[PDB]
Amino acid sequence: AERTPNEEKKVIGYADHNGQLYNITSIYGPVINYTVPDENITINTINRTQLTINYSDYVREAFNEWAPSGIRVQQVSSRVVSFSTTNYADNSLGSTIFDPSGNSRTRIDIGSFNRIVMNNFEKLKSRGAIPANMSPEEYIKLKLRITIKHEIGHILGLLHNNEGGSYFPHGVGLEVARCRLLNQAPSIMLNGSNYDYIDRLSHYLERPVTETDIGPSRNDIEGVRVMRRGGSGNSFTNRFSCLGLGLAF
Amino acid sequence: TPQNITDLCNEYQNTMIYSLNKEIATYTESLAGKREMVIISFSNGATFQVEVPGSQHLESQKRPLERMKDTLRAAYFTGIKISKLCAWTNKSPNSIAAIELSN
Amino acid sequence: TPQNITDLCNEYQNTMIYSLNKEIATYTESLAGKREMVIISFSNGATFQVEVPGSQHLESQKRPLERMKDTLRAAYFTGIKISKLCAWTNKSPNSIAAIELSNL
Amino acid sequence: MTPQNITDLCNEYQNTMIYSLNKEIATYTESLAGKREMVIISFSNGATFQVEVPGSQHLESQKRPLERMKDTLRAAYFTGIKISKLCAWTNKSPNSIAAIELSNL
Amino acid sequence: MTPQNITDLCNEYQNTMIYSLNKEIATYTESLAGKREMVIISFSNGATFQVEVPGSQHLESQKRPLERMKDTLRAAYFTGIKISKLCAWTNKSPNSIAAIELSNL
Amino acid sequence: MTPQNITDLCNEYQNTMIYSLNKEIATYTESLAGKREMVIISFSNGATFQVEVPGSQHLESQKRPLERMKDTLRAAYFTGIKISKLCAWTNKSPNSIAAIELSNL
Ligand SMILES: [Zn+2]
Numbered sequence: 069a070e071r072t073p074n075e076e077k078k079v080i081g082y083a084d085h086n087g088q089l090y091n092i093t094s095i096y097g098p099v100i101n102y103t104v105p106d107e108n109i110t111i112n113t114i115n116r117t118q119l120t121i122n123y124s125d126y127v128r129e130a131f132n133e134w135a136p137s138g139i140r141v142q143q144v145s146s147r148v149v150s151f152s153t154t155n156y157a158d159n160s161l162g163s164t165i166f167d168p169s170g171n172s173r174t175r176i177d178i179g180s181f182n183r184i185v186m187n188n189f190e191k192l193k194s195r196g197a198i199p200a201n202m203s204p205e206e207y208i209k210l211k212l213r214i215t216i217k218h219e220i221g222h223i224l225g226l227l228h229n230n231e232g233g234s235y236f237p238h239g240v241g242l243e244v245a246r247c248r249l250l251n252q253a254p255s256i257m258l259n260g261s262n263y264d265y266i267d268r269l270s271h272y273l274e275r276p277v278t279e280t281d282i283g284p285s286r287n288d289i290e291g292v293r294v295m296r297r298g299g300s301g302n303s304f305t306n307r308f309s310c311l312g313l314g315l316a317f
Numbered sequence: 318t319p320q321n322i323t324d325l326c327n328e329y330q331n332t333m334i335y336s337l338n339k340e341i342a343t344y345t346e347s348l349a350g351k352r353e354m355v356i357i358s359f360s361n362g363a364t365f366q367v368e369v370p371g372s373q374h375l376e377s378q379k380r381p382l383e384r385m386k387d388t389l390r391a392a393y394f395t396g397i398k399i400s401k402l403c404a405w406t407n408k409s410p411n412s413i414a415a416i417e418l419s420n
Numbered sequence: 421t422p423q424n425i426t427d428l429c430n431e432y433q434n435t436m437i438y439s440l441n442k443e444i445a446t447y448t449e450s451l452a453g454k455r456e457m458v459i460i461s462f463s464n465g466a467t468f469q470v471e472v473p474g475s476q477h478l479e480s481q482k483r484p485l486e487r488m489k490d491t492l493r494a495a496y497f498t499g500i501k502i503s504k505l506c507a508w509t510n511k512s513p514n515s516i517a518a519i520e521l522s523n524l
Numbered sequence: 525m526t527p528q529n530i531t532d533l534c535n536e537y538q539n540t541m542i543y544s545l546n547k548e549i550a551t552y553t554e555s556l557a558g559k560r561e562m563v564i565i566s567f568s569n570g571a572t573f574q575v576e577v578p579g580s581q582h583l584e585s586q587k588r589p590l591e592r593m594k595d596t597l598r599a600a601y602f603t604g605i606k607i608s609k610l611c612a613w614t615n616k617s618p619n620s621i622a623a624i625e626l627s628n629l
Numbered sequence: 630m631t632p633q634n635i636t637d638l639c640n641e642y643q644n645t646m647i648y649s650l651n652k653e654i655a656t657y658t659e660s661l662a663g664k665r666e667m668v669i670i671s672f673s674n675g676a677t678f679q680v681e682v683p684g685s686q687h688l689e690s691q692k693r694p695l696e697r698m699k700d701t702l703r704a705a706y707f708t709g710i711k712i713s714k715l716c717a718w719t720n721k722s723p724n725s726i727a728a729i730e731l732s733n734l
Numbered sequence: 735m736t737p738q739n740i741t742d743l744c745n746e747y748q749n750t751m752i753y754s755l756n757k758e759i760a761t762y763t764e765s766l767a768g769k770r771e772m773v774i775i776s777f778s779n780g781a782t783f784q785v786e787v788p789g790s791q792h793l794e795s796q797k798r799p800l801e802r803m804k805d806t807l808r809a810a811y812f813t814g815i816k817i818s819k820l821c822a823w824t825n826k827s828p829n830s831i832a833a834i835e836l837s838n839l
Binding site for chain 2: 548549550551552553554555556557558559560561564566568572574577578591594598601602604616617618
């Protein structure tokens with residue numbers, strides 16, 4: 069594997085107005101209770117493609133992706149985490165509201181997917197970021213899992229890689245769990261305005277990318293471990309996740 | 318031969334064991350002439366030094382003095398908890414003889 | 421014996437305290453002959469050196485000069501904040517005598 | 525016959541044994557006190573090891589390696605890495621470290 | 630006059646130049662081979678630099694700084710941090726490092 | 735005449751060869767035992783290398799570089815960084831490290 073640039077391994081957590089990281093254990097409880105409405109998601113584009121799949125299995129699978137952080141969950145039938153679909157068609161596949169009261173909401177726009185999900189299908193094909201093998205059907209599932217996993221990151225108190233020091237409704241982004249010494253995949257919390265996760269992931273893997281490849285990076289997981297215990301954003305135990313390695317120098 | 322910091326500390330007069338389980342709150346380092354030393358303090362105000370090297374030190378202690386200063390700096394940077402310090406109490410600040418780090 | 425950097429700095433003539441609470445913005449290290457030194461600066465432009473070893477230094481200061489350079493490099497690489505510097509003002513850049521790192 | 529691994533190495537010495545641990549260090553103790561300038565490590569099952577005070581039992585060629593081993597153990601403690609094997613003298617208490625093996629996936 | 634920055638420093642020497650990189654080290658090479666005890670670094674644009682083998686061109690006061698510089702370059706390589714500027718001698722090949730600046734801009 | 739890279743360097747010596755690895759160190763072994771003060775590393779494919787015990791085959795100028803290489807190999811083991819190339823003497827068993835290249839490519 070190639071060497072992921074530090075900027076793509078940087079993980080930013082949500083701190084309040086006094087530099088203290090939100091505690092997602094305190095916010096959600098020891099177990100994250102969440103609701104997911106019954107429908108299978110009905111996305112399809114014209115180039116015409118066709119696809120439907122259960123929202124519940126993807127929230128299921130995505131959550132398990134983040135399980136190495138030590139978080140534990142439980143789907144609860146309709147202050148609770150809310151998943152849903154929307155139809156704004158507004159140039160934004162997914163969106164999450166982080167709520168310190170516990171009622172964090174994640175929405176997956178269906179209209180935006182139908183419009184812009186394949187806008188990068190063959191600039192990804194030809195650069196070899198995705199296998200020429202894959203169908204329009206599974207490039208849309210790939211994008212959906214990535215989108216959902218990314219939004220889960222937000223549920224769990226993470227922001228985007230480049231939002232350190234930036235102000236948000238409930239505070240400020242502060243870098244957590246820094247580790248530059250250990251090579252790893254790019255964060256799945258890359259700012260989508262500035263990076264294409266698939267392209268960066270492929271760049272790292274030095275080959276086309278499938279769905280067994282995507283997921284939270286090592287630092288993403290350590291970031292959530294920090295968010296699970298909260299505390300000061302200036303604490304060294306919170307700011308660094310492999311500084312012990314410095315002793316080997 | 319001692320097996321632990323308490324056994325070691327009991328071999329010396331004018332020493333005491335401090336049980337801390339706390340991270341270092343402040344790290345101070347000086348290269349100033351005749352004050353070439355390190356001072357650490359904890360959140361409860363407890364303060365310790367690694368002494369300026371002098372005639373109270375054997376030649377065999379010169380590198381260990383430097384190693385201890387390295388260890389304390391690393392402990393400060395990483396924010397790890399210090400389990401115990403053994404210190405000479407007839408110095409002000411109390412002077413570190415040994416350190417224990419524990420999981 | 422001093423208990424803190426203010427006590428220590430008050431034992432010496434021609435020193436001043438800078439309370440920074442900032443990470444090092446720039447770290448410069450030179451091996452060039454007669455300029456074997458380290459220079460650091462902060463985002464507000466405040467600049468400090470660790471002096472070239474010379475006749476103004478006791479033999480007891482030789483290893484501490486190297487330790488201070490180690491500490492400044494480590495602080496730079498990790499981005500930990502420097503709380504205070506005690507520095508001699510009759511050198512340009514101001515010359516570091518002691519450093520305090522504090523995390524509270 | 526240069527050894528190829530820690531077992532071959534340890535077999536060249538009398539009164540040494542290999543401890544297969546695969547455990548992280550539980551306790552690290554470091555002393556600068558006169559005549560006790562040493563490092564002691566222990567594991568959660570109470571097994572205890574030292575790096576000896578440098579002395580007449582050491583060759584000149586061992587002086588810097590003693591310091592390297594103390595650096596390695598400190599690094600191992602801080603990082604929480606598993607120690608695979610120790611080669612240690614059994615006629616010392618605590619057992620005295622002669623060599624260490626670290627091994628990953 | 631003591632210089633205030635790497636540019637002032639570099640201007641005190643004949644045959645040195647400031648190289649602006651703002652890049653991480655792409656390749657780090659370290660040799661212990663006799664008469665070639667040196668470090669070579671290169672960047673993604675192909676720019677290559679050395680820390681010279683210690684020799685008669687060095688003052689006694691430069692011996693420890695040479696080792697310090699090699700330590701700094703290794704640490705920069707492992708951590709992937711950007712190198713802002715190098716001051717290097719142009720009459721050596723690879724260009725020989727006299728000073729380094731690291732900056733977070 | 736000064737090498738620009740590890741291959742140029744390795745070509746200056748008899749009984750050395752370049753190994754292209756692009757692998758992390760799998761096992762790190764460090765010994766302070768008398769006359770065996772050495773480091774041995776191995777890779778997952780079984781490839782094994784040593785840093786030799788300091789001896790009469792070494793110039794005084796190689797003494798600190800031997801220690802630097804051992805430092806670099808320990809850091810490489812702890813960080814799991816990939817080793818790109820080793821230049822090694824093949825007339826030793828294990829083959830003996832003369833130079834190392836770490837590369838982001
Ligand atoms: Zn986002």
